[model samples]
Target: SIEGRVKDVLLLDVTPLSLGIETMGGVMTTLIAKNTTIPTKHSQVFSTAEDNQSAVTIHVLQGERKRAADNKSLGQFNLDGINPAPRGMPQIEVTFDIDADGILHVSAKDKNSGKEQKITIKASSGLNEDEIQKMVRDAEANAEADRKFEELVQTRNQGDHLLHSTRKQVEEA
Candidate 1:
């Protein structure tokens, strides 16, 4: 059994909400690309729905779909009192990108009124203490990896500088 050591690694993570944003033709567009890394933050941009449509619908969805009727509705909110913009005006910027440990961060900001709303995904999903300890132990076990990565960067930088200097010398010679 001396030939066998514990080599443990597995691919697992939490998924963000089945998310979507409104696109052209009033059709909804989903954010958060599936299988994207987490704690992930995803964002989208939305403007007034129609002329004089001062409120934008934050139709929170949970599914892979392009229509409001087709997706699971998680929640809906109106970004109200948006400074009046003509139809087809850029009014709000939404950005959603997740972090490494599988949590969702969503924010929507009005490019006009400077209003913003943020959702920090306290996922109903919870991990047990044992799981956290396992990940921590694994990270501690890989502490030497930081040194290896630093060495790689140093080697690459040295090679790059040497190449550039040699090219310069040849050009001058």
Candidate 2:
């Protein structure tokens, strides 16, 4: 079990795997790298490429594969009904969050727009929130029991010293 810290977390993303989707170019790109801050949040903005293009399609993929199709398909987005904006001026925001269990989350939203898309990426490990909490509770209980046991041992040692006291009796006499 790892201790909680308020300041910094140890580097745990040792075998970080990148997740992104394949595009028309048949290429896969990394949106977020591993070993990023826990519960880490980040956002990236992309500009529109065409005018009156009230829609954009985003293909999402996750895995370490170089080819888009070779990687597992996470999801895809067909953003439509976008507000009218200049071809090169429209902005698209993509946000990323990595949870404490090292799971990745991808989200997107427009500036001042209420609509948003979020996707959760789970870690390969089986440890979930409930399991982690249970383990912590058990460990804490054991620690408390150990402390109490130590105190009892101290009391026994003192009692023994007074009851079987050949050395003490010799010293006093």
Candidate 3:
């Protein structure tokens, strides 16, 4: 005969919302997908979009939206002191690490200069179910508006880059 007995048990939790960063074209580039097991780490390399770019702002976002502007902004930090170079020449490695307690630690390292910046997010208290569902519905409802807004943002960014380059050229000449 066997006796009913209970042994020590362990409980694991998963992330509720997708976590990612903003990339070129104002798109949400997910580093860690939603429902991933906790205590996870992901890293990706990103580069500057303009010439002689020495700084990169890392925008931490939380949501399932295709566009960054449509997602919820957690925080943003700039990793400067990069070796100024042409676009796509500098290597910036962004890393996302979530601990067992759901604390998110984000870091961006300048591979060439070895400069790094970091941000910590208390993701456990992020969004509720209601907010998450509403965000999804809003994204679906305003798809066309989001697309047009992204295009306008891209165009303005390009213009700003051109202006910066021209100003730098004239100053150096």
Candidate 4:
């Protein structure tokens, strides 16, 4: 009777890989970090680098590398139809949403015009089970190295920010 009363339950899962997109200077900008609980969502804003740029290419990648080229490319899509504007004028919002089944949905939107492009990715699309296992092991093996690289990136970003602000202040003064 107890066995007959039993019911099925769904278990929570976590993402096994860090997912991000390529940004300026070939940097891998992480949107969703590794080991985050399933059914999570994250978004970030980016702008064009060239004046009058009307489109932005979104490259989806998975890994722990600070450089985009070193990471595994999952997929990519172009979000076009943006209004021609000066460099860093158009606001593009990129969103990464993961479902409980570990499927990924990526969307990029032109905030000024409300245009959007999106793609859906399955777990088996880019990384196979064995590759995922290998990646997990590799991540564990290189945890220390990854931490150092992350620190370097943070320091570089802080320096760049300081330089930019200092230049702006100097110009105004």
lDDT of 2 by residue, 1-173 (tens): 55432112246633144555433233345566445556677666554344333444444544443322223445455555566654544456666777766566776565536346676766453223323234235632453234322432222322111111111112110
User: How many Å off is the CA of 127 in candidate 4?
Assistant: 7.3
How would you encode candidate 3's per-residue C-alpha lDDT over 1-173 as one tens digit per residue?
33211111124255555667544444454667664677788776665555344666555656555634336666565555566566645456667788877677778766776678877777655455435445546753464236523532343433112211221211110
In candidate 1, position 21 carries an lDDT of 48
- Please give the ranking of all candidate structures by TM-score, highest first, separated by commas: 3, 4, 2, 1
lDDT of each: 0.42, 0.43, 0.53, 0.51
Error of 3 at 18 (Å): 1.0
Best by TM-score: 3
Best by lDDT: 3
Ranking under lDDT, best-scoring first?
3, 4, 2, 1
- For candidate 3, list the clashing residue pairs, or say none: none
TM-score of 3: 0.64
How would you encode candidate 1's per-residue C-alpha lDDT over 8-95 as one tens digit per residue? Answer: 1134243533455423332334666546545655555544534232455554544433322323344445555556544545446767
Residue pairs that clash (backbone atoms under 3 angstroms), model 2: 20-61, 21-60, 21-61
Show pairs that collide, candidate 4: none
lDDT of the structure predicted as candidate 1: 0.42
Pitting candidate 1 against candidate 3, the one with the higher lDDT is 3
RMSD of each: 20.1, 27.6, 10.1, 11.6
